[PDB]
Amino acid sequence: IQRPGSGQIQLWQFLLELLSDSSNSSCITWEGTNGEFKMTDPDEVARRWGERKSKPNMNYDKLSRALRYYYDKNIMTKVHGKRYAYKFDFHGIAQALQ
Amino acid sequence: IQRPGSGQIQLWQFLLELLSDSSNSSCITWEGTNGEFKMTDPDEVARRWGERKSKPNMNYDKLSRALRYYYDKNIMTKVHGKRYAYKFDFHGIAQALQ
């Protein structure tokens, strides 16, 4: 776990940070089913990630590629049939906290 | 979030810590459905919590009462139809990380 709001934060924790504050819902919001979320403005999520990390040329293409990497790590999966929807895996997140 | 293994740890984080290590499965284990777990030896979980917190007279009666408190906080719910089964709520856990 890194310090909330920090530049060293990992992507999984950054998305949980944005989700924890309902005022972010115009760009990213919980869906209601445990751990499932949707990027209501995926370009805005990518912009905010770019700004946190000060990474030039960050965009949704790059953000989605990073999210795909979490599947193998058991930290997240995509949700099919929905737009820009993903689901956190509690089993990998618990490990990521230690 | 507190330091893993610390005496100051909260109950929700202590249970995630035990769950993160599959070798604990004789007393507490993931069920497979996202966030659901079962206390395969609830008295052993209570003993380990008692030992972490150095709380005399800790027992399953007291542990279960603490778990009930998390329902109102949106951190956990009981699972009906199953023995000693509970489910973490990602929505309250995300907040608990900030």
Side-chain angles (χ1 to χ4, degrees), chain B residues 6-38:
Chain B
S6 65
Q8 285 159 333
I9 201 165
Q10 303 297 113
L11 181 56
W12 70 263
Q13 186 188 336
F14 175 81
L15 299 175
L16 289 174
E17 183 174 302
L18 294 182
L19 285 160
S20 75
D21 179 354
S22 69
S23 82
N24 297 307
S25 286
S26 292
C27 72
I28 186 167
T29 197
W30 292 127
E31 190 272 346
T33 300
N34 205 24
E36 187 172 320
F37 61 98
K38 56 197 251 211

mmCIF file of all heavy atoms in Angstrom, chain B residues 6-38:
data_model
loop_
_atom_site.group_PDB
_atom_site.id
_atom_site.type_symbol
_atom_site.label_atom_id
_atom_site.label_comp_id
_atom_site.label_asym_id
_atom_site.label_seq_id
_atom_site.Cartn_x
_atom_site.Cartn_y
_atom_site.Cartn_z
ATOM 1 N N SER B 6 0.715 -5.987 12.930
ATOM 2 C CA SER B 6 0.817 -5.119 14.092
ATOM 3 C C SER B 6 -0.302 -5.372 15.075
ATOM 4 O O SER B 6 -1.361 -5.905 14.727
ATOM 5 C CB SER B 6 0.813 -3.613 13.705
ATOM 6 O OG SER B 6 -0.424 -3.340 13.156
ATOM 7 N N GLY B 7 -0.043 -4.982 16.320
ATOM 8 C CA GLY B 7 -1.018 -5.078 17.390
ATOM 9 C C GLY B 7 -2.109 -4.057 17.282
ATOM 10 O O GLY B 7 -3.220 -4.347 17.732
ATOM 11 N N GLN B 8 -1.830 -2.928 16.640
ATOM 12 C CA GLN B 8 -2.845 -1.892 16.381
ATOM 13 C C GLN B 8 -3.831 -2.172 15.274
ATOM 14 O O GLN B 8 -4.735 -1.381 15.059
ATOM 15 C CB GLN B 8 -2.142 -0.552 16.130
ATOM 16 C CG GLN B 8 -1.636 0.034 17.413
ATOM 17 C CD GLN B 8 -0.515 1.061 17.213
ATOM 18 O OE1 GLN B 8 0.252 1.025 16.223
ATOM 19 N NE2 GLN B 8 -0.372 1.944 18.193
ATOM 20 N N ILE B 9 -3.639 -3.260 14.557
ATOM 21 C CA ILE B 9 -4.472 -3.626 13.414
ATOM 22 C C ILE B 9 -5.948 -3.673 13.789
ATOM 23 O O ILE B 9 -6.350 -4.087 14.914
ATOM 24 C CB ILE B 9 -3.956 -4.966 12.857
ATOM 25 C CG1 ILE B 9 -4.380 -5.216 11.410
ATOM 26 C CG2 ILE B 9 -4.417 -6.127 13.721
ATOM 27 C CD1 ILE B 9 -3.639 -6.308 10.721
ATOM 28 N N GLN B 10 -6.803 -3.257 12.863
ATOM 29 C CA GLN B 10 -8.237 -3.493 13.015
ATOM 30 C C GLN B 10 -8.668 -4.889 12.580
ATOM 31 O O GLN B 10 -8.037 -5.512 11.775
ATOM 32 C CB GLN B 10 -9.051 -2.421 12.272
ATOM 33 C CG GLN B 10 -8.723 -0.996 12.745
ATOM 34 C CD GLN B 10 -9.082 -0.830 14.182
ATOM 35 O OE1 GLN B 10 -8.202 -0.650 15.038
ATOM 36 N NE2 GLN B 10 -10.386 -0.939 14.479
ATOM 37 N N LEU B 11 -9.813 -5.338 13.109
ATOM 38 C CA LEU B 11 -10.302 -6.688 12.804
ATOM 39 C C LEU B 11 -10.423 -6.984 11.291
ATOM 40 O O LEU B 11 -10.051 -8.051 10.844
ATOM 41 C CB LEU B 11 -11.593 -6.962 13.550
ATOM 42 C CG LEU B 11 -12.217 -8.335 13.356
ATOM 43 C CD1 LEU B 11 -11.283 -9.469 13.690
ATOM 44 C CD2 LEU B 11 -13.485 -8.421 14.168
ATOM 45 N N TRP B 12 -11.028 -6.067 10.533
ATOM 46 C CA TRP B 12 -11.187 -6.271 9.058
ATOM 47 C C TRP B 12 -9.874 -6.545 8.392
ATOM 48 O O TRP B 12 -9.748 -7.514 7.585
ATOM 49 C CB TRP B 12 -11.944 -5.076 8.404
ATOM 50 C CG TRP B 12 -11.166 -3.784 8.361
ATOM 51 C CD1 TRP B 12 -11.267 -2.775 9.245
ATOM 52 C CD2 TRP B 12 -10.210 -3.350 7.374
ATOM 53 N NE1 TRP B 12 -10.369 -1.756 8.931
ATOM 54 C CE2 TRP B 12 -9.750 -2.095 7.747
ATOM 55 C CE3 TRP B 12 -9.667 -3.934 6.212
ATOM 56 C CZ2 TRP B 12 -8.787 -1.402 7.004
ATOM 57 C CZ3 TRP B 12 -8.741 -3.203 5.469
ATOM 58 C CH2 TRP B 12 -8.282 -2.013 5.885
ATOM 59 N N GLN B 13 -8.800 -5.841 8.781
ATOM 60 C CA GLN B 13 -7.532 -5.981 8.143
ATOM 61 C C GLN B 13 -6.827 -7.257 8.618
ATOM 62 O O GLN B 13 -6.106 -7.926 7.832
ATOM 63 C CB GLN B 13 -6.653 -4.754 8.395
ATOM 64 C CG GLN B 13 -5.364 -4.810 7.607
ATOM 65 C CD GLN B 13 -4.367 -3.753 7.939
ATOM 66 O OE1 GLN B 13 -4.691 -2.668 8.441
ATOM 67 N NE2 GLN B 13 -3.126 -3.997 7.520
ATOM 68 N N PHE B 14 -7.036 -7.575 9.896
ATOM 69 C CA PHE B 14 -6.485 -8.846 10.449
ATOM 70 C C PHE B 14 -7.041 -10.059 9.706
ATOM 71 O O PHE B 14 -6.306 -10.957 9.371
ATOM 72 C CB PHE B 14 -6.808 -8.917 11.914
ATOM 73 C CG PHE B 14 -6.412 -10.215 12.630
ATOM 74 C CD1 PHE B 14 -5.123 -10.431 13.047
ATOM 75 C CD2 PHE B 14 -7.358 -11.136 12.934
ATOM 76 C CE1 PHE B 14 -4.794 -11.626 13.698
ATOM 77 C CE2 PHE B 14 -7.006 -12.330 13.597
ATOM 78 C CZ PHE B 14 -5.730 -12.533 13.975
ATOM 79 N N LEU B 15 -8.323 -10.061 9.468
ATOM 80 C CA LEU B 15 -8.947 -11.214 8.715
ATOM 81 C C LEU B 15 -8.423 -11.271 7.265
ATOM 82 O O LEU B 15 -8.083 -12.370 6.769
ATOM 83 C CB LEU B 15 -10.420 -11.139 8.779
ATOM 84 C CG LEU B 15 -11.060 -11.197 10.140
ATOM 85 C CD1 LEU B 15 -12.577 -10.984 10.038
ATOM 86 C CD2 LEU B 15 -10.710 -12.484 10.889
ATOM 87 N N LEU B 16 -8.262 -10.127 6.569
ATOM 88 C CA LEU B 16 -7.651 -10.103 5.250
ATOM 89 C C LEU B 16 -6.208 -10.614 5.287
ATOM 90 O O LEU B 16 -5.772 -11.318 4.396
ATOM 91 C CB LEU B 16 -7.694 -8.721 4.570
ATOM 92 C CG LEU B 16 -8.987 -8.177 4.074
ATOM 93 C CD1 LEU B 16 -8.737 -6.732 3.599
ATOM 94 C CD2 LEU B 16 -9.569 -9.021 2.914
ATOM 95 N N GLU B 17 -5.460 -10.286 6.341
ATOM 96 C CA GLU B 17 -4.091 -10.749 6.508
ATOM 97 C C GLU B 17 -4.075 -12.293 6.605
ATOM 98 O O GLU B 17 -3.201 -12.932 5.987
ATOM 99 C CB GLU B 17 -3.523 -10.108 7.804
ATOM 100 C CG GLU B 17 -2.102 -10.439 8.076
ATOM 101 C CD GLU B 17 -1.568 -9.649 9.285
ATOM 102 O OE1 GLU B 17 -1.600 -8.394 9.258
ATOM 103 O OE2 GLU B 17 -1.119 -10.350 10.217
ATOM 104 N N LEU B 18 -4.947 -12.873 7.401
ATOM 105 C CA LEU B 18 -4.968 -14.330 7.543
ATOM 106 C C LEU B 18 -5.403 -14.988 6.220
ATOM 107 O O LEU B 18 -4.887 -15.990 5.814
ATOM 108 C CB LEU B 18 -5.953 -14.763 8.614
ATOM 109 C CG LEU B 18 -5.670 -14.386 10.059
ATOM 110 C CD1 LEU B 18 -6.730 -14.954 10.948
ATOM 111 C CD2 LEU B 18 -4.351 -14.829 10.532
ATOM 112 N N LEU B 19 -6.350 -14.352 5.547
ATOM 113 C CA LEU B 19 -6.857 -14.898 4.278
ATOM 114 C C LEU B 19 -5.838 -14.843 3.153
ATOM 115 O O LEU B 19 -5.855 -15.678 2.211
ATOM 116 C CB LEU B 19 -8.132 -14.162 3.867
ATOM 117 C CG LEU B 19 -9.412 -14.506 4.654
ATOM 118 C CD1 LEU B 19 -10.458 -13.420 4.509
ATOM 119 C CD2 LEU B 19 -9.988 -15.872 4.254
ATOM 120 N N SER B 20 -4.964 -13.829 3.183
ATOM 121 C CA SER B 20 -3.963 -13.665 2.153
ATOM 122 C C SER B 20 -2.941 -14.815 2.072
ATOM 123 O O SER B 20 -2.263 -14.946 1.064
ATOM 124 C CB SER B 20 -3.211 -12.296 2.370
ATOM 125 O OG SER B 20 -2.302 -12.396 3.459
ATOM 126 N N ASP B 21 -2.785 -15.553 3.183
ATOM 127 C CA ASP B 21 -1.863 -16.695 3.275
ATOM 128 C C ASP B 21 -2.681 -17.984 3.323
ATOM 129 O O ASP B 21 -3.312 -18.294 4.323
ATOM 130 C CB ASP B 21 -1.008 -16.511 4.530
ATOM 131 C CG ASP B 21 -0.020 -17.646 4.769
ATOM 132 O OD1 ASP B 21 -0.026 -18.653 4.065
ATOM 133 O OD2 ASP B 21 0.822 -17.503 5.705
ATOM 134 N N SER B 22 -2.693 -18.720 2.209
ATOM 135 C CA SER B 22 -3.519 -19.962 2.109
ATOM 136 C C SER B 22 -3.191 -20.980 3.162
ATOM 137 O O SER B 22 -4.044 -21.857 3.500
ATOM 138 C CB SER B 22 -3.315 -20.583 0.682
ATOM 139 O OG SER B 22 -2.045 -21.064 0.610
ATOM 140 N N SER B 23 -1.988 -20.894 3.776
ATOM 141 C CA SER B 23 -1.678 -21.823 4.837
ATOM 142 C C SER B 23 -2.523 -21.713 6.096
ATOM 143 O O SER B 23 -2.519 -22.666 6.882
ATOM 144 C CB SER B 23 -0.178 -21.805 5.163
ATOM 145 O OG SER B 23 0.144 -20.761 5.990
ATOM 146 N N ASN B 24 -3.264 -20.639 6.244
ATOM 147 C CA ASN B 24 -4.244 -20.459 7.324
ATOM 148 C C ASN B 24 -5.610 -21.133 7.170
ATOM 149 O O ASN B 24 -6.503 -20.974 8.032
ATOM 150 C CB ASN B 24 -4.454 -18.979 7.665
ATOM 151 C CG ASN B 24 -3.225 -18.339 8.186
ATOM 152 O OD1 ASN B 24 -2.608 -18.859 9.160
ATOM 153 N ND2 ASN B 24 -2.877 -17.209 7.630
ATOM 154 N N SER B 25 -5.737 -21.913 6.089
ATOM 155 C CA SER B 25 -7.093 -22.379 5.647
ATOM 156 C C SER B 25 -7.785 -23.332 6.613
ATOM 157 O O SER B 25 -9.015 -23.496 6.505
ATOM 158 C CB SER B 25 -7.037 -22.921 4.237
ATOM 159 O OG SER B 25 -6.902 -21.901 3.257
ATOM 160 N N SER B 26 -7.045 -23.934 7.541
ATOM 161 C CA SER B 26 -7.645 -24.736 8.575
ATOM 162 C C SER B 26 -8.395 -23.942 9.596
ATOM 163 O O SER B 26 -9.228 -24.565 10.351
ATOM 164 C CB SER B 26 -6.611 -25.606 9.289
ATOM 165 O OG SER B 26 -6.085 -26.628 8.403
ATOM 166 N N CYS B 27 -8.195 -22.656 9.628
ATOM 167 C CA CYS B 27 -9.047 -21.817 10.464
ATOM 168 C C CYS B 27 -9.870 -20.780 9.760
ATOM 169 O O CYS B 27 -10.974 -20.456 10.222
ATOM 170 C CB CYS B 27 -8.309 -21.204 11.603
ATOM 171 S SG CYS B 27 -7.143 -19.905 11.323
ATOM 172 N N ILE B 28 -9.379 -20.275 8.624
ATOM 173 C CA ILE B 28 -10.131 -19.251 7.882
ATOM 174 C C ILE B 28 -9.651 -19.291 6.421
ATOM 175 O O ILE B 28 -8.428 -19.352 6.169
ATOM 176 C CB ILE B 28 -9.949 -17.814 8.477
ATOM 177 C CG1 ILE B 28 -10.874 -16.825 7.760
ATOM 178 C CG2 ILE B 28 -8.525 -17.297 8.479
ATOM 179 C CD1 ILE B 28 -10.982 -15.467 8.484
ATOM 180 N N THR B 29 -10.591 -19.285 5.470
ATOM 181 C CA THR B 29 -10.237 -19.486 4.072
ATOM 182 C C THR B 29 -11.200 -18.753 3.160
ATOM 183 O O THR B 29 -12.381 -18.620 3.478
ATOM 184 C CB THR B 29 -10.172 -20.985 3.728
ATOM 185 O OG1 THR B 29 -9.459 -21.205 2.503
ATOM 186 C CG2 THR B 29 -11.493 -21.617 3.544
ATOM 187 N N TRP B 30 -10.724 -18.326 2.008
ATOM 188 C CA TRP B 30 -11.651 -17.814 1.001
ATOM 189 C C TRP B 30 -12.618 -18.869 0.499
ATOM 190 O O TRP B 30 -12.249 -20.009 0.325
ATOM 191 C CB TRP B 30 -10.857 -17.258 -0.201
ATOM 192 C CG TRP B 30 -10.055 -16.021 0.042
ATOM 193 C CD1 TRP B 30 -8.693 -15.842 -0.228
ATOM 194 C CD2 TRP B 30 -10.532 -14.725 0.421
ATOM 195 N NE1 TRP B 30 -8.339 -14.592 0.020
ATOM 196 C CE2 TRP B 30 -9.448 -13.838 0.338
ATOM 197 C CE3 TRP B 30 -11.829 -14.210 0.720
ATOM 198 C CZ2 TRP B 30 -9.573 -12.474 0.685
ATOM 199 C CZ3 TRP B 30 -11.950 -12.840 0.990
ATOM 200 C CH2 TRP B 30 -10.818 -12.008 0.975
ATOM 201 N N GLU B 31 -13.870 -18.511 0.199
ATOM 202 C CA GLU B 31 -14.870 -19.419 -0.331
ATOM 203 C C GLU B 31 -14.894 -19.570 -1.855
ATOM 204 O O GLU B 31 -15.353 -20.623 -2.377
ATOM 205 C CB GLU B 31 -16.235 -18.932 0.170
ATOM 206 C CG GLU B 31 -17.341 -19.896 -0.102
ATOM 207 C CD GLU B 31 -17.998 -19.697 -1.472
ATOM 208 O OE1 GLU B 31 -17.779 -18.625 -2.127
ATOM 209 O OE2 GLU B 31 -18.772 -20.625 -1.877
ATOM 210 N N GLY B 32 -14.404 -18.535 -2.524
ATOM 211 C CA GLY B 32 -14.275 -18.495 -3.991
ATOM 212 C C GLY B 32 -15.097 -17.382 -4.587
ATOM 213 O O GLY B 32 -14.644 -16.685 -5.503
ATOM 214 N N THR B 33 -16.282 -17.129 -4.042
ATOM 215 C CA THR B 33 -17.100 -16.018 -4.526
ATOM 216 C C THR B 33 -16.511 -14.718 -4.032
ATOM 217 O O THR B 33 -16.184 -14.650 -2.864
ATOM 218 C CB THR B 33 -18.445 -16.020 -3.809
ATOM 219 O OG1 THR B 33 -19.091 -17.228 -4.068
ATOM 220 C CG2 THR B 33 -19.319 -14.801 -4.225
ATOM 221 N N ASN B 34 -16.381 -13.702 -4.874
ATOM 222 C CA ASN B 34 -15.556 -12.538 -4.543
ATOM 223 C C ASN B 34 -15.850 -11.915 -3.138
ATOM 224 O O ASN B 34 -16.922 -11.375 -2.889
ATOM 225 C CB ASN B 34 -15.662 -11.506 -5.653
ATOM 226 C CG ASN B 34 -14.446 -10.557 -5.761
ATOM 227 O OD1 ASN B 34 -13.296 -10.852 -5.347
ATOM 228 N ND2 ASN B 34 -14.719 -9.386 -6.380
ATOM 229 N N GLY B 35 -14.851 -12.020 -2.291
ATOM 230 C CA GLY B 35 -14.932 -11.419 -0.989
ATOM 231 C C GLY B 35 -15.537 -12.329 0.100
ATOM 232 O O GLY B 35 -15.507 -11.923 1.243
ATOM 233 N N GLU B 36 -16.144 -13.447 -0.269
ATOM 234 C CA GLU B 36 -16.771 -14.331 0.729
ATOM 235 C C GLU B 36 -15.717 -15.245 1.341
ATOM 236 O O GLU B 36 -14.817 -15.768 0.653
ATOM 237 C CB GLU B 36 -17.770 -15.185 0.089
ATOM 238 C CG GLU B 36 -18.584 -15.995 1.031
ATOM 239 C CD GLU B 36 -19.765 -16.733 0.343
ATOM 240 O OE1 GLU B 36 -20.440 -16.133 -0.567
ATOM 241 O OE2 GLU B 36 -20.002 -17.921 0.761
ATOM 242 N N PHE B 37 -15.793 -15.423 2.659
ATOM 243 C CA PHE B 37 -14.860 -16.292 3.347
ATOM 244 C C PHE B 37 -15.585 -17.129 4.400
ATOM 245 O O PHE B 37 -16.705 -16.828 4.751
ATOM 246 C CB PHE B 37 -13.717 -15.560 4.020
ATOM 247 C CG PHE B 37 -14.112 -14.574 5.094
ATOM 248 C CD1 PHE B 37 -14.086 -14.906 6.447
ATOM 249 C CD2 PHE B 37 -14.471 -13.264 4.726
ATOM 250 C CE1 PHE B 37 -14.373 -13.944 7.398
ATOM 251 C CE2 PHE B 37 -14.777 -12.322 5.694
ATOM 252 C CZ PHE B 37 -14.716 -12.655 7.022
ATOM 253 N N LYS B 38 -14.912 -18.168 4.864
ATOM 254 C CA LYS B 38 -15.538 -18.945 5.950
ATOM 255 C C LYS B 38 -14.496 -19.220 7.018
ATOM 256 O O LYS B 38 -13.294 -19.440 6.702
ATOM 257 C CB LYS B 38 -16.160 -20.194 5.472
ATOM 258 C CG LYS B 38 -15.325 -21.157 4.728
ATOM 259 C CD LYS B 38 -16.183 -22.190 3.928
ATOM 260 C CE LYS B 38 -16.129 -23.594 4.500
ATOM 261 N NZ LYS B 38 -16.284 -24.551 3.379
#
